[PDB]
Amino acid sequence: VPKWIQLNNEIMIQKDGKFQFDKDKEAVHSYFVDYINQNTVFFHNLKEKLDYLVENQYYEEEFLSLYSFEDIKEVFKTAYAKKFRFPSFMSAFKFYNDYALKTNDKKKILERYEDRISIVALFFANGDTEKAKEYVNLMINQEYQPSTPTFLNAGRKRRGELVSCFLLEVNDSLNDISRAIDISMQLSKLGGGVSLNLSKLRAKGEAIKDVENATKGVVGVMKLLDNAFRYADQMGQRQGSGAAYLNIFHRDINDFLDTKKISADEDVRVKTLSIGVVIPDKFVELAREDKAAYVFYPHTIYKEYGQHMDEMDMNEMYDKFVDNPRVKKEKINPRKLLEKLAMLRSESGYPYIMFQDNVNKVHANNHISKVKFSNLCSEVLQASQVSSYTDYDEEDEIGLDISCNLGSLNILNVMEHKSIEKTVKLATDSLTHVSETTDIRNAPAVRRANKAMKSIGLGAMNLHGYLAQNGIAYESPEARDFANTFFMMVNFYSIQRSAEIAKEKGETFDQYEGSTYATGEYFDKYVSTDFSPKYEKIANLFEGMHIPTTEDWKKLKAFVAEHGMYHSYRLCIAPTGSISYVQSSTASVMPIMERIEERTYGNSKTYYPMPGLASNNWFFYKEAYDMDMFKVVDMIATIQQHIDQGISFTLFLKDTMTTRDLNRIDLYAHHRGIKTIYYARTK
Amino acid sequence: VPKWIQLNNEIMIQKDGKFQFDKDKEAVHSYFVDYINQNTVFFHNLKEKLDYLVENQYYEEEFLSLYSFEDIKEVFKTAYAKKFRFPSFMSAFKFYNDYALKTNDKKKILERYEDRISIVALFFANGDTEKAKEYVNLMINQEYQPSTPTFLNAGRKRRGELVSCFLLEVNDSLNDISRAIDISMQLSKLGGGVSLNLSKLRAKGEAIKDVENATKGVVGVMKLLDNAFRYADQMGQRQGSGAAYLNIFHRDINDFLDTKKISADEDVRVKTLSIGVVIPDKFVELAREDKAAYVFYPHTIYKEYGQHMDEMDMNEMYDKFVDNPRVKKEKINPRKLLEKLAMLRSESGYPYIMFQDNVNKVHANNHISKVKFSNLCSEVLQASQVSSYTDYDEEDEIGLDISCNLGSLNILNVMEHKSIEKTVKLATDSLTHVSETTDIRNAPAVRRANKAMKSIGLGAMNLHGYLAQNGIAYESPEARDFANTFFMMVNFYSIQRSAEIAKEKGETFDQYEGSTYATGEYFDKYVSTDFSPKYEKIANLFEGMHIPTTEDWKKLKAFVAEHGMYHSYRLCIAPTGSISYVQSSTASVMPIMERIEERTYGNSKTYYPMPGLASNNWFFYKEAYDMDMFKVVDMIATIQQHIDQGISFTLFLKDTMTTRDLNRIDLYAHHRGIKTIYYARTK
Amino acid sequence: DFTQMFYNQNVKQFWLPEEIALNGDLLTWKYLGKNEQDTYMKVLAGLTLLDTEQGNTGMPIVAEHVDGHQRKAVLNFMAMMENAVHAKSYSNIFMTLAPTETINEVFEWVKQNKYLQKKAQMIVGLYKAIQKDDEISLFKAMVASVYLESFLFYSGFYYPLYFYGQGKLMQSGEIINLILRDEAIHGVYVGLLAQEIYNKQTEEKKAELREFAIDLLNQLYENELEYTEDLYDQVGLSHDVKKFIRYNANKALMNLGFDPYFEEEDINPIVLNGLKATVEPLKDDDFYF
Amino acid sequence: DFTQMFYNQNVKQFWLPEEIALNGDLLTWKYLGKNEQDTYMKVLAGLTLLDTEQGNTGMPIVAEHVDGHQRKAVLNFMAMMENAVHAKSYSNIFMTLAPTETINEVFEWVKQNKYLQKKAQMIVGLYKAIQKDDEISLFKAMVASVYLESFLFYSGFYYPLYFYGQGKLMQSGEIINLILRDEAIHGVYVGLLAQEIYNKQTEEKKAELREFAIDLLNQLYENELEYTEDLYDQVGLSHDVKKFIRYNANKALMNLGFDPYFEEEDINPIVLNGLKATVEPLKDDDFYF
Ligand SMILES: Nc1ncnc2c1ncn2[C@@H]1O[C@H](COP(=O)(O)OP(=O)(O)OP(=O)(O)O)[C@@H](O)[C@H]1O
Ligand SMILES: Nc1ncnc2c1ncn2[C@@H]1O[C@H](COP(=O)(O)OP(=O)(O)OP(=O)(O)O)[C@@H](O)[C@H]1O
Ligand SMILES: Cc1cn([C@H]2C[C@H](O)[C@@H](COP(=O)(O)OP(=O)(O)OP(=O)(O)O)O2)c(=O)[nH]c1=O
Ligand SMILES: [Mg+2]
Ligand SMILES: [Mg+2]
Ligand SMILES: [Mn+2]
Ligand SMILES: [Mn+2]
Ligand SMILES: [Mn+2]
Numbered sequence A, B: 001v002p003k004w005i006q007l008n009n010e011i012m013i014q015k016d017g018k019f020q021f022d023k024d025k026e027a028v029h030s031y032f033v034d035y036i037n038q039n040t041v042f043f044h045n046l047k048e049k050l051d052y053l054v055e056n057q058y059y060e061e062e063f064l065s066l067y068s069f070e071d072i073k074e075v076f077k078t079a080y081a082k083k084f085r086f087p088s089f090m091s092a093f094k095f096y097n098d099y100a101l102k103t104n105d106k107k108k109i110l111e112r113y114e115d116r117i118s119i120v121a122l123f124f125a126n127g128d129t130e131k132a133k134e135y136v137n138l139m140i141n142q143e144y145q146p147s148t149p150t151f152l153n154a155g156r157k158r159r160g161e162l163v164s165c166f167l168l169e170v171n172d173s174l175n176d177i178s179r180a181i182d183i184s185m186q187l188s189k190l191g192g193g194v195s196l197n198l199s200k201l202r203a204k205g206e207a208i209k210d211v212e213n214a215t216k217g218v219v220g221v222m223k224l225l226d227n228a229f230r231y232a233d234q235m236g237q238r239q240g241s242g243a244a245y246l247n248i249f250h251r252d253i254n255d256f257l258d259t260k261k262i263s264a265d266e267d268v269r270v271k272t273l274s275i276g277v278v279i280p281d282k283f284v285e286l287a288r289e290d291k292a293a294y295v296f297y298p299h300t301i302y303k304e305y306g307q308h309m310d311e312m313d314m315n316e317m318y319d320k321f322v323d324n325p326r327v328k329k330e331k332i333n334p335r336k337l338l339e340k341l342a343m344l345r346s347e348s349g350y351p352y353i354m355f356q357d358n359v360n361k362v363h364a365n366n367h368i369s370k371v372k373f374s375n376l377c378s379e380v381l382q383a384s385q386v387s388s389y390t391d392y393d394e395e396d397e398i399g400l401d402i403s404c405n406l407g408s409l410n411i412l413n414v415m416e417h418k419s420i421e422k423t424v425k426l427a428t429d430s431l432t433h434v435s436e437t438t439d440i441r442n443a444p445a446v447r448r449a450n451k452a453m454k455s456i457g458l459g460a461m462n463l464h465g466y467l468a469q470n471g472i473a474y475e476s477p478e479a480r481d482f483a484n485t486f487f488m489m490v491n492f493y494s495i496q497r498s499a500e501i502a503k504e505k506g507e508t509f510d511q512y513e514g515s516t517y518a519t520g521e522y523f524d525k526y527v528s529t530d531f532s533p534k535y536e537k538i539a540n541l542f543e544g545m546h547i548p549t550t551e552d553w554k555k556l557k558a559f560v561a562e563h564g565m566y567h568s569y570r571l572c573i574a575p576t577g578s579i580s581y582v583q584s585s586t587a588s589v590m591p592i593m594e595r596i597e598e599r600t601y602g603n604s605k606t607y608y609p610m611p612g613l614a615s616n617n618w619f620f621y622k623e624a625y626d627m628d629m630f631k632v633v634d635m636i637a638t639i640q641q642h643i644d645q646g647i648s649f650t651l652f653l654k655d656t657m658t659t660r661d662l663n664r665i666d667l668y669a670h671h672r673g674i675k676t677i678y679y680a681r682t683k
Numbered sequence C, D: 001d002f003t004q005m006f007y008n009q010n011v012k013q014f015w016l017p018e019e020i021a022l023n024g025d026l027l028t029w030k031y032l033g034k035n036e037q038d039t040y041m042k043v044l045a046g047l048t049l050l051d052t053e054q055g056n057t058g059m060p061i062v063a064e065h066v067d068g069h070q071r072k073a074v075l076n077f078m079a080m081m082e083n084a085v086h087a088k089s090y091s092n093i094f095m096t097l098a099p100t101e102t103i104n105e106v107f108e109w110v111k112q113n114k115y116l117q118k119k120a121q122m123i124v125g126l127y128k129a130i131q132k133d134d135e136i137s138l139f140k141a142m143v144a145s146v147y148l149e150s151f152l153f154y155s156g157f158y159y160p161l162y163f164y165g166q167g168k169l170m171q172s173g174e175i176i177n178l179i180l181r182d183e184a185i186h187g188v189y190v191g192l193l194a195q196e197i198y199n200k201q202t203e204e205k206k207a208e209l210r211e212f213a214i215d216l217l218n219q220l221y222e223n224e225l226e227y228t229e230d231l232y233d234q235v236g237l238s239h240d241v242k243k244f245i246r247y248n249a250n251k252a253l254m255n256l257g258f259d260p261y262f263e264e265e266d267i268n269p270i271v272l273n274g275l276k277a278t279v280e281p282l283k284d285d286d287f288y289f
């Protein structure tokens, strides 16, 4: 066993009844003085390194050609001047195993952390040396972390796409289904997770040109997509991951759910395609009143009204659907469907739950389209227009397929540096650059939506780490007050940066004029309610930083009205799974699953303590499963009120609790304004 | 139990030690006195019937509008003047259960046999009343039978395409694979059987964008195609049928074959995807000499030579591939592979066997392309060019995808009417009309090849029926003499009609000038070898009909040289599954499987004796399983020497014979010039 | 001269209770009086106990002491039938016809029933007294086994057969007939093995073995009479069943090569009415024609 | 928690030798070299001899000491398969491929063979050491049984599977595959019975039983390596057979609820080719907060 492995395992060997957390630090030293420094490839100077990486097809030469070598040297020197040290063994291990650039045979390390950060910063700046240094300082301080696709692939010749998630709308036609399968394979080839809205597809037993009971429903398309994602599995490196979203009022909703039952037959079971359910407020109202609900056949509704079932408001059209004899429907028990959802989530963690009305009551771009589904991580909530892929030799009507670039603020590092504004603006600029340089030649709706919406996702990580390292319980009202203030600041500065980009470029996102940003409605709660901290401890935490007031929000509203906004969507809180290790941060705004996690790598086992875990903050690092899910819902709703897109909200459940407890948590989330629920992980 | 079913089951009841075959005739009468006439919709006049069928979206207005009502009435009167009577119960049952037009509620019969024949004739003639009457006389004499798609769908508004055999070339790309899946779905939606060539696809463990061990091979593509064919199942009417062809020198050939093993796992086995193997002469030579063979990685060959492995002659390329270090290959035992093929055919009848050099040594259009694969029934053998389907908003390079037009001569009815020439020419004209009226807007290469090649397949059936009713054993040399003469006359008149159509329209098929028809090579064996019958009995059978001599063939060769040939391909012998029942004929040129076949429809049993079966010809109606497969191979080769495309050749084996016997039959078929082997049906 | 034909007969008779659907008996069962249902449950429970011990103990122990792999294979197969097929079939019948509480009660009833405990004590005692390489102790256990197979089961078999013969409980009856068909061949086979051992003895020893067999039969018989009265008096059939068990006692004696002991009697006629392809390699001559 | 499920799986896997016609194997047998025929014969005799011990002693002795009627029935069924089905199947394969004199000589050789005897007697020794009412000695015998079913057979199974995966000796290979499928479930079942005993022990006693199991595995494994070279060097397969032994040793350990001992290895592809939360209804007022 390696020396650093033994040093890391020495953490759990208690001394005087206490964990040896400091041993972890020793491990990193070993991991660098025995493995990383020996396995790294050193050159005489930076010129030889850059030339070797360029000619050997490791780096794209275009982004490096925008800078003179003196500027690149200055950027690299700025990166190395911080003398960044990984405080935990797992941070360095995760970076050098998942994100550091290696040779073709993967026998040596070509990229250090500073090298990777410098390359990403130079790609972000697009020829601006000062901007590149700003990005270097932002990432080496670990205030901002680009998503895994962006951080791993920026400036690389053998790179994939920098966009993490893609959302596709599938129209009710064989041509559209085949095009959706093709685009899903193309985007999984690019490495991104693909989500498909199957609510427009007509249910099982519908007519294909006057011959009835002919359609296979959404389950056949689900099987096709599952095989497509199995085939396109990132060249066999990462399993192809897809998501299917169906409205709960679709007739196939049961069969949909039956794809995830552990007793499902092979002709129905789907195993590589995640499932999500979109629940309008009408379904929750029907379940609450115990009135029997009706699921609908989409094609009959489309024939009668000319629009898809998910294209209009069910809260106002459900009674018209039920009373219409030309609309076909089936009777269901909404409470039984809710119990089935809870049982499925207990068994397998599926489906994702999207509260459609919670998303669309604060959605700023309802004029473009209502949000009808979410992404594979159930945090992207954007307007999408379905595409009409016609026959060959016929022009296709290209719609809008959602796609946003992810980037997370490290809350602990951002607040320690007292740089919410600067970090938010620089992250917005980096995400705007990632969107601008993204061009996908096989997904036309994705390309058009990227060019028009200009949507980005700016997330946050290390919420629980910051709260526990500052002596604040994650479930406490003080923690929710901190989240309210911090994310109001993040939203304020993201809107300010979006408006500044719109002013400097003279262009807004497409159809911005009909948005609530243009009409000023979006700023209502910000121009009437003060989001400054209500607790003295939180206010002290925010000292040295100008917390925006109602007057600052009014000025920002006027600025947006004058100049517009460059981005249709700005903030989305992704799960941030593996890149949180490198940043020494807790995953996303979720509470920690465990204080010390035991992970098996190779034939060895390693223990990763939570960042900053110690004796004095052991009980502030409360495990998520031990927490009240209602207070976690309260925290997520408090954050969500300042996030325009959704938050990947994983439910952390105990084995003792029943499906009724899961249903109660889901209904409280819906009541509190939670937009989406990601996972039901049971301990 | 209905009266006609009792009268049909009375056949097996033996009187005086003989089957009551004549009772079947009585059954037909009952089937018409009790059921057909009662459930047949009658109109006051044909005008009312045509108006009702057109208005209720049963027929098409376009083809009926080309004639005055007097001409349509005259065509219907010509059809009804024959007073055609089905000689067996199963003929009428199959027609009125499969082909007769029924109401939307499927309880009444709108079309009789004469009505359907008249409608198909009017569709064929395209406005010529005399030509329509000629077609009516052809089909009511049952000399020619349009295929199930053409016969069932001609003149019907609610219909699939008139072509059901489609051959697709799949290029080695994700875009091409997705396009192939889409086209397969679209053609299965039209009701056609789709065959895909997977030899150009790179094997498992190949590089994608210079990353190693990334390709899933052809088995993942087969899984995708199997899912696509399961999804597209004719609006839930018939099981989606598809075929995949792989060259035996493709490295995936074992895994390909492993998709049909019973022991194969769920992630390996494809259930609704037929498989065929293309066997070049090089593989047979390697197996014969017991030299170990090599299966090659197609992408390495493409990188080294710039052409696909299946696009070049393996006979001259195999040694260069083996000696090339940059071509990756795996060692195999060709005799072990042959034994595996025989074992798989014994277990499941798969794969289909295509002898590439047997096809291509007589292929007339090798300049366009060599025949690389066959159809789902393993009888279509045509030149195909792969298409380069690029990314979106980029122009695709459309190639040639095979789609031939099926139609079968009834050898008994044709020869008893002494009308080989007239029937062949009229069938060629009808096939040309159906090929010209076919327009598929979702298969670009299929449409392009249909427009360019103008390839049709004119088959024959009732060969064994005709031979048995004339006191000739199917395995006798006299039967092969008759087949030689009859199919040489069929080829002569098909070529003459093709040249006449080319002269009339002033156009040949695309790239005809490079064909062996243009150079006169095709006629070589016809201008030197006399194909007149060598037996007096066969000559007396051909009495009253002019048998083309060598001088006639020289005149035809000169005529083709002067005027060209309209069809790239003219003759292919399809299995003729259900139309053989309606025509009261034995299926294809195959020998009969059973003298009397027992079938179960609903909860009732039915008995179909072979047409013309009696005590006198009971011995001549020898069952296929009791026959020597070498003599069946000899007869099929005798026919194949006059057929430009292949013949659906099913092997009929006993359970006693082993895989050595199957391999011997396959090798004798290869030796005798058999182009394709369809199935290995074990009794 | 016989094991191979018994092997073939035993394996060709293989069956599972699940082959017989039992829901068809639901109505004729519902229609029986409480007395009739009680006797029926108890009768089958007594049979279950006998097969439990024949499968767990009797057949395996005899298999252990009998020489020859083929003889052992037959005895092992018979043992499997006893506990994996026969004993289990009764639970299939119980689970179809009776509620769980009635099932629980009848199994409690077997534990406390003095005649059923006595007969188990006697039979199992003899099985467990077998001494390695001691043919006399083995003979005694084989006599006990024949008496279980060909005599003791029959106080139980009477009632399902009695119903089957009247067209009642015919699915359960079909199971019982299959069990009976098996026991008949089991009794013959074990009888032949017992005769082998008996035939090795002196005339004096034979005389003692006949005494053992007859004394044991009488002791079991007297107990079976009391058991029969206890079960059948409430359904009015005790005298009829007694005639049946005497009939079968004679068959058991005959299976042992002994003369019948009880006089012949008329049995209820109702009960009488109740009775890949082959692969060759390719030669170089198969490539030339 | 498991006996009825295993009962079902066992009885539904029932088969008989007569179902597979063996004569067509002579069409590939005649084409094997002397070393191939010799190895096959020796392997076959090895399997036959070990399986006889399991039928005559291993399964019946475990059935005798295990408590529970349903477990005894399943164990009886498994013993039946060894003696009535497997033993006849091995005999049938032999009689098809070799003349009587050759069979007698191969069995004489394998009976004297040092490596076959070492493992056969080690296993039999543990079966003979079981003491009445001593669950520790029963556990040790169960470990031995699992090692035979799930590990020791596989140095032998390798060769028929190797031919079967190549299209050679397909009829006997089909038979061997059915036998192997039975031994797999036997090993899993006996493994669960051993874990039941293991879980009733103290922590010190558990550690002691683990040491016993690993020590026994080591002794058997080192002898398997020698057995393997002795049989397979002449046909050049020993390296790959050794990988197959370790892979199956790991399965045997997992059957006993223990961690794998050997690192994961890939197996010869030819041989491979041969081979709820509590539902609680919503009570209303759960929709209001
Ligand atoms: N935790 C760590 N994170 C990142 N790099 C590290 C870490 N520990 C060691 N290294 C690398 O290994 C080298 C070993 O040097 P070390 O940290 O022991 O101190 P040093 O030799 O006094 O110099 P310096 O600390 O100034 O780099 C470091 O210079 C650095 O490049
Ligand atoms: N074998 C048959 N094949 C086809 N149609 C038949 C057959 N038998 C009877 N029919 C139908 O039933 C009708 C009655 O025929 P039938 O044998 O009674 O005498 P017919 O002289 O042909 O009668 P019609 O006056 O109808 O022409 C036929 O006209 C035809 O429509
Ligand atoms: C062709 C086909 C369609 N479908 C379903 C899936 C599609 O969502 C739906 C629409 O198919 P379409 O491609 O729209 O078929 P169509 O346009 O010819 O019929 P229509 O005019 O009624 O639109 O039909 C199947 O389930 N199986 C099939 O094989
Ligand atoms: Mg449509
Ligand atoms: Mg390519
Ligand atoms: Mn019994
Ligand atoms: Mn018995
Ligand atoms: Mn065995």
Ligand SMILES: [Mn+2]
Binding pocket: D054, D082, D149, D182, D183, D186
């Ligand atoms: Mn076993």
